[PDB]
């Protein structure tokens, strides 16, 4: 059968235990060469629309956002024509999360963001060390799909370095093709995209924990002091 593997098995026998124990989980060859290629083509096609926009921060600061993240991005719901395979990816990611039942931490994943198709043009841009969700915006799981064929960080950098909270050892995740990455979006996983010296494509979706997200949105609305 085509990729990916049954989500139930992968999630319950890998992602879940892996996530609870490490908070960082890598699934290589998630969709296989055919699909990975297709989405890598939809993403480059999307990129060629020149539509991508500099990556933005939750609470913008410092001269420019480019001081924090040097990727250009675009959001995909996954049903856009020319992004049906990204939709496929997104649905696969969703299937894995769904099959983790309620065992991803204390999280009740009931939703996610659109896919953030990201691209570090490859001019040495990266993403300084950050926490995807440091304030409790609802993001509990960060899911990333890499589209970088034969990516050699020794040459093109672009390593996603994650610093699992409490440890003095960091994980170096190569933005390699067909690689699916999962890691707690909160403070447990500060991480950085090391300077990418080649075009680095990744598709990120953040899963939301019902309660924290519900409270994220409500608190977003207000400004309190």
């Amino acid at each position: 059968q085509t990729k990916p593997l049954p989500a139930l098995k992968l999630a319950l026998e890998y992602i879940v235990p892996c996530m609870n124990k490490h908070g960082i989980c890598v699934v290589d060859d998630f969709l296989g060469k055919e699909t990975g290629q297709q989405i890598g083509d939809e993403v480059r096609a999307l990129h060629d629309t020149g539509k991508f926009t500099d990556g933005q921060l939750v609470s913008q600061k410092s001269d420019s956002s480019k001081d924090i993240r040097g990727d250009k991005i675009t959001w995909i719901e996954g049903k856009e024509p020319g992004c049906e395979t990204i939709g496929l990816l997104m649905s696969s990611m969703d299937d894995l999360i769904r099959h983790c039942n309620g065992k991803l931490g204390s999280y009740k994943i009931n939703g996610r963001t659109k896919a953030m198709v990201a691209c570090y043009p490859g001019n040495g841009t990266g993403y300084v060390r950050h926490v995807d969700n440091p304030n409790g915006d609802g993001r509990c799981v960060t899911c990333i799909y890499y589209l970088n064929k034969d990516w050699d960080a020794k040459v093109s950098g672009g390593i996603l370095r994650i610093f699992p909270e409490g440890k003095a050892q960091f994980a170096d995740i190569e933005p390699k093709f067909d690689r699916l990455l999962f890691f707690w979006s909160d403070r447990r996983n500060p991480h950085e995209v090391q300077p990418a010296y080649a075009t680095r494509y990744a598709i990120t979706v953040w899963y939301f924990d019902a309660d924290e997200r519900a409270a994220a949105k409500v608190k977003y609305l207000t400004g309190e002091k």
């Binding site: 990556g55 933005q56 921060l57 939750v58 609470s59 913008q60 600061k61 410092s62 924090i68 993240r69 959001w75 719901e77 997104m90 969703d94 999360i97 769904r98 994943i109 009931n110 939703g111 996610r112 963001t113 659109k114 953030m116 993403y127 300084v128 060390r129 950050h130 926490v131 995807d132 969700n133 440091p134 304030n135 915006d137 993001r139 403070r187 990120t204 953040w206 899963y207 939301f208 997200r213 994220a216 949105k217 977003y220």
Partner: peptide, 17 residues
């Protein structure tokens, strides 16, 4: 601080699982 480094996300267009 961290808030200014975190990857921006819409607070409005969430996809329901």
């Amino acid at each position: 601080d961290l808030e200014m480094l975190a990857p921006y996300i819409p607070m409005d267009d969430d996809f329901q699982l």
